[PDB]
Design a protein around this ligand. Structure first.
Ligand SMILES: Nc1ccn([C@@H]2O[C@H](COP(=O)(O)O)[C@@H](O)[C@H]2O)c(=O)n1
Length: 124
């Protein structure tokens, strides 16, 4: 299919832009990264930092994942992120999302060799 590291990049990386501008950013990106394909994914975060800066988080602050696993890492500083949340009215296949741009720390789960991000856990 897609490796776990490639799937994480397709779903969460957006380094071409420094930040979301229109309230339309999430509807466009969720569609173009195929996250509304079989359903509307309810929550998805896009990170506007270089891939290298996000991968560096795997060697930063070790914290437990929401699942109780302990291979989660929190970035020491904040990063530009865009939170995409499905609206209460949205209905597959007419998926609608609310866009929220912010600067927060991210929490990612890392794995393999090289040890890289394979899952976006939360933003704080
Ligand atoms: N702040 C958040 C919370 C979850 N997510 C996405 O939602 C998926 C499922 O969320 P859970 O962490 O709730 O399992 C995550 O794998 C991640 O792709 C996200 O992108 N941003």
């Amino acid at each position: 299919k897609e490796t776990a590291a490639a799937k994480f990049e397709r779903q969460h990386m957006d380094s071409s832009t420094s930040a979301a501008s229109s309230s339309n950013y999430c509807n466009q990106m969720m569609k173009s990264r195929n996250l509304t394909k079989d359903r509307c994914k309810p929550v998805n975060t896009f990170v506007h930092e270089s891939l290298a800066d996000v991968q560096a988080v795997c060697s930063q602050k070790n914290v437990a994942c929401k699942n109780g696993q302990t291979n989660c890492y929190q970035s020491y500083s904040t990063m530009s992120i865009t939170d995409c949340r499905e609206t209460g009215s949205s209905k597959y296949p007419n998926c609608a999302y609310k866009t929220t741009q912010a600067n927060k720390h991210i929490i990612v789960a890392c794995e393999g060799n090289p040890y890289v991000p394979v899952h976006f856990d939360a933003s704080v």
